[PDB]
Amino acid sequence: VVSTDEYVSRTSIYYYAGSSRLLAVGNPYFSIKNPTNAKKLLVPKVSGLQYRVFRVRLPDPNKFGFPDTSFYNPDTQRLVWACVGLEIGRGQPLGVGVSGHPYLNKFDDTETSNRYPAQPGSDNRECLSMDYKQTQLCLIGCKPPTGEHWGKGVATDCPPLELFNSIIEDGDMVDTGFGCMDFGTLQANKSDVPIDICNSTCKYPDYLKMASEPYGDSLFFFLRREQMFVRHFFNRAGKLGEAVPDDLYIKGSGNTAVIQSSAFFPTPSGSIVTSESQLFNKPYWLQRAQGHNNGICWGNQLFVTVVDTTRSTNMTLCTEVKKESTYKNENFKEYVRHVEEYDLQFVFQLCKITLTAEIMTYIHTMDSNILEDWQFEDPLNKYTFWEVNLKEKFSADLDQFPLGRKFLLQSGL
Among 329, 365, 375, 381, binds a copy of itself (CB under 8 A): 329
Q: For the CB of residue 361, give the shortest distance to a copy of itself in the complex, in Å.
A: 17
Among 242, 361, 364, 368, binds a copy of itself (CB under 8 A): 242
CB 187 within 8 A of CB 198: yes
Q: Which is nearer to a copy of itself, 316 or 375 (CB)?
A: 316
According to the binding rule CB under 8 A, does residue 151 interact with a copy of itself? no
Q: Which is nearer to a copy of itself, 79 or 168 (CB)?
A: 168
Among 4, 14, 17, 18, binds a copy of itself (CB under 8 A): 18
Per CB under 8 A, contacts with a copy of itself among 365-394 are none
Spatial CA neighbour of 107 closest among 237, 194, 263: 237
Inter-CA distances, 56 with 185, 190, 256, 368, Å: 33, 36, 62, 21
Between CA 247 and CA 168 the distance in angstroms is: 44
Spatial CA neighbour of 47 closest among 153, 150, 143, 170: 170
Per CB under 8 A, contacts with a copy of itself among 175-194 are 175, 177-181, 186-193
CA 2 to chain centre: 30
The CA-based diameter of the chain, rounded to the nearest angstrom, is: 93
According to the binding rule CB under 8 A, does residue 299 interact with a copy of itself? no
Per CB under 8 A, contacts with a copy of itself among 48-87 are none
Among 60, 148, 367, 373, binds a copy of itself (CB under 8 A): 148
Q: For the CB of residue 57, give the shortest distance to a copy of itself in the complex, in Å.
A: 21
According to the binding rule CB under 8 A, does residue 37 interact with a copy of itself? no
The SS3 of residue 106 is coil
According to the binding rule CB under 8 A, does residue 411 interact with a copy of itself? no
Q: How many residues does the chain have?
A: 413
Q: For the CB of residue 397, give the shortest distance to a copy of itself in the complex, in Å.
A: 8
According to the binding rule CB under 8 A, does residue 241 interact with a copy of itself? yes
Phi, psi for residue 9 in degrees, rounded to 5: -85, 125
Could you tell me which stretch among 57-65, 67-75, 156-164, 352-360 binds a copy of itself (CB under 8 A)?
156-164
Per CB under 8 A, contacts with a copy of itself among 338-357 are 339, 341, 343
Looking from the CA of 99 toward its CB, the CA atoms found within 13 Å total 29
The SS3 of residue 382 is helix
Among 13, 166, 266, 362, binds a copy of itself (CB under 8 A): 266
CB 11 within 8 A of CB 71: yes
CA 88 to chain centre: 14
